[PDB]
Amino acid sequence: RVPQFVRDVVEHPPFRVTVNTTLETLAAYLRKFPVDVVPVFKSVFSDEVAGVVYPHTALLLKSKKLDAKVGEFLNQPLVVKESWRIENVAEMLISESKWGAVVVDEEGKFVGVVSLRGLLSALLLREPKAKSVAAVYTSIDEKKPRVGFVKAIEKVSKIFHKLVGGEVDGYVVLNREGGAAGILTVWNFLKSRRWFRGSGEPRAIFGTRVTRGESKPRGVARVWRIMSRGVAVANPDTPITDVARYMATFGIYVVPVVDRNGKVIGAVTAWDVLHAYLYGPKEGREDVEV
Amino acid sequence: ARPARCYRRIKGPPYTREEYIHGAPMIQIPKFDMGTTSAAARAAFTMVAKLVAEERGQIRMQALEAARQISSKYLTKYVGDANYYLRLNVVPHHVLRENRMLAMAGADRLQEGMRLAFGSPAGRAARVEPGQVIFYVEFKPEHLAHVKEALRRAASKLPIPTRIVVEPK
RNA sequence: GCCCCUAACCCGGCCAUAGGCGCCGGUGCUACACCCGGUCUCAUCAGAACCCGGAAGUUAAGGCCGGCGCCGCGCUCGGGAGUACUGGGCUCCGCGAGGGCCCGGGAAACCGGCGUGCUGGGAGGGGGC
RNA sequence: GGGCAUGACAGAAAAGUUACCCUAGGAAUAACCGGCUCGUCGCGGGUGAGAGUCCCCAUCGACCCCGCGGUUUGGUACCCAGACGUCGUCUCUUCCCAUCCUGGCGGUGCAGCAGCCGCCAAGGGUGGGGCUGCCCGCCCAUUAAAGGGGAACGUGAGAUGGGU
RNA sequence: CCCCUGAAAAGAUAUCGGGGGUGCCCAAAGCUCGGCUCAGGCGGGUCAGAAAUCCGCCGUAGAGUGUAAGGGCAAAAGCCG
RNA sequence: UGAAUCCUGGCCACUGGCGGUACGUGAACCCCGGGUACAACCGGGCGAAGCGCCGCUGAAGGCCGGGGGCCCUCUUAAGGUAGCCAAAUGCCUUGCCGGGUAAGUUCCGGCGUGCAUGAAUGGAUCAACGAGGUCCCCACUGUCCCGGCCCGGG
RNA sequence: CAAUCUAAAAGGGCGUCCCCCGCCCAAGACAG
RNA sequence: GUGAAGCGGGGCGAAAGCCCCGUGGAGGCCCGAAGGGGUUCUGAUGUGCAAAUCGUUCCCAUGACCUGGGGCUAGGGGCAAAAGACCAAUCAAGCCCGGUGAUAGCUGGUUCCCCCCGAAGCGGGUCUCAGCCCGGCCUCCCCGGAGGCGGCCGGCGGGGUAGAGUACUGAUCGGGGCCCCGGUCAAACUCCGAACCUGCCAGCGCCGUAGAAGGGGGGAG
Ligand SMILES: [Mg+2]
Ligand SMILES: [Mg+2]
Ligand SMILES: [Mg+2]
Ligand SMILES: [Mg+2]
Ligand SMILES: [Mg+2]
Ligand SMILES: [Mg+2]
Ligand SMILES: [Mg+2]
Ligand SMILES: [Mg+2]
Ligand SMILES: [Mg+2]
Ligand SMILES: [Mg+2]
Ligand SMILES: [Mg+2]
Ligand SMILES: [Mg+2]
Ligand SMILES: [Mg+2]
Ligand SMILES: [Mg+2]
Ligand SMILES: [Mg+2]
Ligand SMILES: [Mg+2]
Ligand SMILES: [Mg+2]
Ligand SMILES: [Mg+2]
Ligand SMILES: [Mg+2]
Ligand SMILES: [Mg+2]
Ligand SMILES: [Mg+2]
Ligand SMILES: [Mg+2]
Ligand SMILES: [Mg+2]
Ligand SMILES: [Mg+2]
Ligand SMILES: [Mg+2]
Ligand SMILES: [Mg+2]
Ligand SMILES: [Mg+2]
Ligand SMILES: [Mg+2]
Ligand SMILES: [Mg+2]
Ligand SMILES: [Mg+2]
Ligand SMILES: [Mg+2]
Ligand SMILES: [Mg+2]
Ligand SMILES: [Mg+2]
Ligand SMILES: [Mg+2]
Ligand SMILES: [Mg+2]
Ligand SMILES: [Mg+2]
Ligand SMILES: [Mg+2]
Ligand SMILES: [Mg+2]
Ligand SMILES: [Mg+2]
Ligand SMILES: [Mg+2]
Ligand SMILES: [Mg+2]
Ligand SMILES: [Mg+2]
Ligand SMILES: [Mg+2]
Ligand SMILES: [Mg+2]
Ligand SMILES: [Mg+2]
Ligand SMILES: [Mg+2]
Ligand SMILES: [Mg+2]
Ligand SMILES: [Mg+2]
Numbered sequence A: 001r002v003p004q005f006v007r008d009v010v011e012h013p014p015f016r017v018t019v020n021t022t023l024e025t026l027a028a029y030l031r032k033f034p035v036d037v038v039p040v041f042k043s044v045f046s047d048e049v050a051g052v053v054y055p056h057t058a059l060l061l062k063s064k065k066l067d068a069k070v071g072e073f074l075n076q077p078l079v080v081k082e083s084w085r086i087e088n089v090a091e092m093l094i095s096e097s098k099w100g101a102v103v104v105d106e107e108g109k110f111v112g113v114v115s116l117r118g119l120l121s122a123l124l125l126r127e128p129k130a131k132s133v134a135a136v137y138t139s140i141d142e143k144k145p146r147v148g149f150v151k152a153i154e155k156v157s158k159i160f161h162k163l164v165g166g167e168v169d170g171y172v173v174l175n176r177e178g179g180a181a182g183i184l185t186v187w188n189f190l191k192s193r194r195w196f197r198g199s200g201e202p203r204a205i206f207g208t209r210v211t212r213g214e215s216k217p218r219g220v221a222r223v224w225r226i227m228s229r230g231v232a233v234a235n236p237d238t239p240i241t242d243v244a245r246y247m248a249t250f251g252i253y254v255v256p257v258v259d260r261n262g263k264v265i266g267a268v269t270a271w272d273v274l275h276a277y278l279y280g281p282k283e284g285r286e287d288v289e290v
Numbered sequence B: 001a002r003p004a005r006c007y008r009r010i011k012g013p014p015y016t017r018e019e020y021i022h023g024a025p026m027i028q029i030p031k032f033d034m035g036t037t038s039a040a041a042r043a044a045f046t047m048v049a050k051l052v053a054e055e056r057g058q059i060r061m062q063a064l065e066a067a068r069q070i071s072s073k074y075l076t077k078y079v080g081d082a083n084y085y086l087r088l089n090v091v092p093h094h095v096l097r098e099n100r101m102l103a104m105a106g107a108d109r110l111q112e113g114m115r116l117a118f119g120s121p122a123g124r125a126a127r128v129e130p131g132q133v134i135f136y137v138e139f140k141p142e143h144l145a146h147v148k149e150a151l152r153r154a155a156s157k158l159p160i161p162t163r164i165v166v167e168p169k
Numbered sequence C: 001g002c003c004c005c006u007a008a009c010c011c012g013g014c015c016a017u018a019g020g021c022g023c024c025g026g027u028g029c030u031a032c033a034c035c036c037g038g039u040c041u042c043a044u045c046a047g048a049a050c051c052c053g054g055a056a057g058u059u060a061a062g063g064c065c066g067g068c069g070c071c072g073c074g075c076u077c078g079g080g081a082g083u084a085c086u087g088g089g090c091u092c093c094g095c096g097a098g099g100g101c102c103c104g105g106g107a108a109a110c111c112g113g114c115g116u117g118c119u120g121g122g123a124g125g126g127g128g129c
Numbered sequence D: 001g002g003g004c005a006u007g008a009c010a011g012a013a014a015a016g017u018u019a020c021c022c023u024a025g026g027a028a029u030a031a032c033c034g035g036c037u038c039g040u041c042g043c044g045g046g047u048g049a050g051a052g053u054c055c056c057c058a059u060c061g062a063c064c065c066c067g068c069g070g071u072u073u074g075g076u077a078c079c080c081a082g083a084c085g086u087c088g089u090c091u092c093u094u095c096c097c098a099u100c101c102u103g104g105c106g107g108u109g110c111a112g113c114a115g116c117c118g119c120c121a122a123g124g125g126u127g128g129g130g131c132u133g134c135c136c137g138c139c140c141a142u143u144a145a146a147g148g149g150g151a152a153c154g155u156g157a158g159a160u161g162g163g164u
Numbered sequence E: 001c002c003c004c005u006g007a008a009a010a011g012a013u014a015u016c017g018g019g020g021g022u023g024c025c026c027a028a029a030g031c032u033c034g035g036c037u038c039a040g041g042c043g044g045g046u047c048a049g050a051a052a053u054c055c056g057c058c059g060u061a062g063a064g065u066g067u068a069a070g071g072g073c074a075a076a077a078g079c080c081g
Numbered sequence F: 001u002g003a004a005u006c007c008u009g010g011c012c013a014c015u016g017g018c019g020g021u022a023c024g025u026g027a028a029c030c031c032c033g034g035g036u037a038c039a040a041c042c043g044g045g046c047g048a049a050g051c052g053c054c055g056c057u058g059a060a061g062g063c064c065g066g067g068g069g070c071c072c073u074c075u076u077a078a079g080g081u082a083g084c085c086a087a088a089u090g091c092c093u094u095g096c097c098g099g100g101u102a103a104g105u106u107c108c109g110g111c112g113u114g115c116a117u118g119a120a121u122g123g124a125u126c127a128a129c130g131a132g133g134u135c136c137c138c139a140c141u142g143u144c145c146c147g148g149c150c151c152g153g154g
Numbered sequence G: 001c002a003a004u005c006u007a008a009a010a011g012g013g014c015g016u017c018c019c020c021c022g023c024c025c026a027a028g029a030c031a032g
Numbered sequence H: 001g002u003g004a005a006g007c008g009g010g011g012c013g014a015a016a017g018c019c020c021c022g023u024g025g026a027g028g029c030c031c032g033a034a035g036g037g038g039u040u041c042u043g044a045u046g047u048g049c050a051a052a053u054c055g056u057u058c059c060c061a062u063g064a065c066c067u068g069g070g071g072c073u074a075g076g077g078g079c080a081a082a083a084g085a086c087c088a089a090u091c092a093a094g095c096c097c098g099g100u101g102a103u104a105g106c107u108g109g110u111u112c113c114c115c116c117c118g119a120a121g122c123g124g125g126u127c128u129c130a131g132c133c134c135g136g137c138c139u140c141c142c143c144g145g146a147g148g149c150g151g152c153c154g155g156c157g158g159g160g161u162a163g164a165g166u167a168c169u170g171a172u173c174g175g176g177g178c179c180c181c182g183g184u185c186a187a188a189c190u191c192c193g194a195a196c197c198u199g200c201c202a203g204c205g206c207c208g209u210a211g212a213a214g215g216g217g218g219g220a221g
Helices: A023-032 A055-060 A086-096 A116-124 A156-164 A186-191 A240-250 A270-278 B061-078 B141-155
Strands: A038-043 A046-053 A079-081 A100-104 A110-115 A148-151 A171-174 A180-184 A254-258 A264-269 B033-035 B047-053 B057-060 B084-088 B094-098 B120-128 B133-139 B162-168
Touching (some): A023 A186, A086 A100, A116 A240, A180 A254, A240 A254, A240 A270, A264 A270, B061 B133, B061 B141
Antiparallel strands (some): B033 B084, B047 B133
């Protein structure tokens, strides 16, 4: 009984988010139960969907003293049907580079959401076209891949916008020698707030002696202070199914790839894994023995 | 979704080349021709009603879909699917944009206000001209009152004034 | 030598009215060909091609000419149409996006009709100086 | 004449921090109020799938669409940097109506007791406490009811000074 | 710095406008001469196959031309020597 | 660091300090060669501290997470022990359950994968002391309900 | 009696003035 | 006021010891004047009595206590039970005089009359964006010497926009048998294609020997 249709992978988040949920509450929810896409309902007593938000939306918080609700940052959802096949929905996720979609039935009633985790798990019960990481892996020399490479001592302000904006799905963090120090994704920013510092527009300083009317960020956290340490690395001959199992289980969509000396030469993204399960090796690549 | 008045007027060039547009939304209209579509059976129908636009403007995809549902349901109930042909005549080619702060939509979308103002896709609309046919019906003269009622219901869902023109084929 | 007239051949201009498909005819002294050979110049896996030497055979094919049909194409022709659009003016209309009036210009698709290479130089042939 | 380089690419050799801060200025430029705008916010209307035993419209109102207000938030940067005292509360006055009660009327899926819905109507009323710096909100005992807004987010040359 | 669009049929033309690219690479991917014709399709042909080499027909470029985009190119600007 | 009392865990990767046989590197002087009738100049040799390298050091500045099967393993070393907690430290959050009030966003007592607690960076800890910050109870009252009259000076 | 300048939409109305079309009445039409 | 060590008596008791009363006079001990300090009312005052005061309520008050006179430490220096306090009403580095009329792309001011002409906020470069330079635009003078062009008509050219189209590249709804027919579209599509703008020549019109074109020089804003 291999899942083939969307109805076999539709998932229901453990928590309910409405338009009045604050970004701080949303971050607390995702700390406990990580999900790839959050449907937002118009109210507590209505199953109508006002839109969706992503884990990245919780990172739009500017200050803990400034009001910010989920309803102010709603994305347009990607909508799929429960009757569609798993491979077809995977194609739409690759096209838009989106981590999930809203599932509706034939009449448009909200059924649930489908995520990258769910599709990866469903394809786990199949046989990849390409079997080695070497066949599908993003090189460190590519111009604008969906994975970043950053030094461990960099400031998080340098890479923050690329993560929250979704231009990459994660970062491989390099030590001084070019080895894999760790992994940085939005989940690192959701688990911990060691990176966070409140900001805001200038205060209404009138009729008083106050010498610093605007908050300024001075000590900026370094990447290795909040990264995931000790992630397993992959080799070109690593099986693609071990990578897929990791990504499906933990929802981390970047895995570093190292040469024999441990130096990072690229990464495997969740989009690379889907490519192996759907088509096979990339153009000009060959599947090495596993 | 914003109120439809925000995208009613034609304020710029058509935005349709989907090979240059990242994340252009998919069309959410399942069918455009309803009833009896085969050309042989349409020869029985001898009357034509048209819901004609009175102004130029942009009709959003969801309004076209809402108009299509109410009219087709009414005709199915009162006229019968074998006794009419209904066609939604315009296609929502134009892509709508919105300038809102969002996550998971690009780094430039994180800058507030009118800095980097070019919007991300927000929907689709059909750009129509005065006199343009929005809905097209073929029917038998015995059902004239029902066809006019179906098109009156369709018009109540549309952002621009329209008028119903009835002529023989 | 010179002037005039004039098929197919040679060198051209414009580059489909010249192209494409099908059918029916015409042309052969000469000219163009198909054609006959490979010692020589030259040529290749291959005298098929290219190149050389020829003149038995043939208008079956090519070339050129005439006719018909369809497709394609062309037109300073009729309609489409003074329509669409537009330069200038307006205390003219409309809630508004926009429209209207006056002076001056003015399409396209399409439908119908007509057309289906024209022409410059030379050789050859004819007539005269 | 060729090369060795300035990528901030018509070419300095160059890290922070100031809430202990200072000077010159800027409404060429932010924060409060005001102006413009109204996406957002609040309020109204069209439509009628569907619910309502039957029955669209007693009560609702999916999918969509037309609006009003300036009451939340934003957008913009027009005025004000030789300066318009920055939240709330107290005190005191007035205005709006999109009416919570009180006056009038109608509908009801109005038997009565109650309830729900609409219309006219702003003369009067709309209070006392617990919690929090609050505003807002939740709650307690009452009550005819314990409406909401505007006035330089009314009012610090009137106070208070808990927060910022 | 470069291409297309914006750009309003001479020229010029901006925005933290839109879609992309550049800090190279190649002793050939540079020069020239000759020959040839590409993608794709069909018919026949021993392994042989959707796809190898061979014979034939069609094929306006649907290929190729290092590299973005736009432009150009068929007895060539492509392919082979 | 901060009386006393019970205690004070694991980590030397990093930033420092210190110790060290050999080796690499490491300035001037000096030595050798070339060059120059002499010099300038060019090459080599020798080579101190230091640095590289190897060790020690946390009551040095400090740090104390994952994955896997008590064991292995990854990342800049280790992997938060005894304790303590919605803390003057918890965003979510007026956290949940009790106390106290008619009603308690504060307070007290518990709970704890604790956004981001923890051991001389001191942990736990309140006897005595306090113009320290806070909650509750009794008494008390013009603080108030809700204002009135009087006295001295303006 | 344009604009700056203080306004108004979808929708409803034979309220009223008017224009056009279809059908009935050839005095056996519409209303009782 | 409390009452440490030490020292008496009495009581219970088997020993040790325990209990009561007294004596004694310790302590950065307690209450509280003087004295010292400076918490509250966020009281009065706030052009003050005062460039820091007054009332009230408070904290310490045998000690790391308060206080007179004399002495030492001096500015990149002192002194600090540490607040970057204090060092003569001056301190994240004193005061005096000197360098010194520091510099300021920034702000303020810049004084009589008439007459002639009369701008600009554009392009390029700049550690350039409140500055400046080279051009455009103004003015004045001189050289030069006959042509010039914000308009129109014509001849001969250029163009690819509006519209149109859906034929190349793409998008898109239906019907019929990969083709045919109908329909919806295109800033980064184009067979076609205006109005319109623009090049040369000729004419018209106007300007020009009271000086066209062109050139040089001064001053700009
Ligand atoms: Mg400041
Ligand atoms: Mg516009
Ligand atoms: Mg430059
Ligand atoms: Mg004000
Ligand atoms: Mg403002
Ligand atoms: Mg709204
Ligand atoms: Mg209704
Ligand atoms: Mg506002
Ligand atoms: Mg301004
Ligand atoms: Mg003003
Ligand atoms: Mg002023
Ligand atoms: Mg004032
Ligand atoms: Mg003032
Ligand atoms: Mg009213
Ligand atoms: Mg106010
Ligand atoms: Mg005041
Ligand atoms: Mg005042
Ligand atoms: Mg305060
Ligand atoms: Mg405070
Ligand atoms: Mg141009
Ligand atoms: Mg090139
Ligand atoms: Mg060639
Ligand atoms: Mg320790
Ligand atoms: Mg523990
Ligand atoms: Mg404690
Ligand atoms: Mg805790
Ligand atoms: Mg507390
Ligand atoms: Mg810790
Ligand atoms: Mg500590
Ligand atoms: Mg610590
Ligand atoms: Mg401690
Ligand atoms: Mg004390
Ligand atoms: Mg309107
Ligand atoms: Mg004492
Ligand atoms: Mg005070
Ligand atoms: Mg006072
Ligand atoms: Mg006074
Ligand atoms: Mg005392
Ligand atoms: Mg300080
Ligand atoms: Mg000094
Ligand atoms: Mg100094
Ligand atoms: Mg001086
Ligand atoms: Mg003048
Ligand atoms: Mg200025
Ligand atoms: Mg002309
Ligand atoms: Mg057009
Ligand atoms: Mg069109
Ligand atoms: Mg032009």
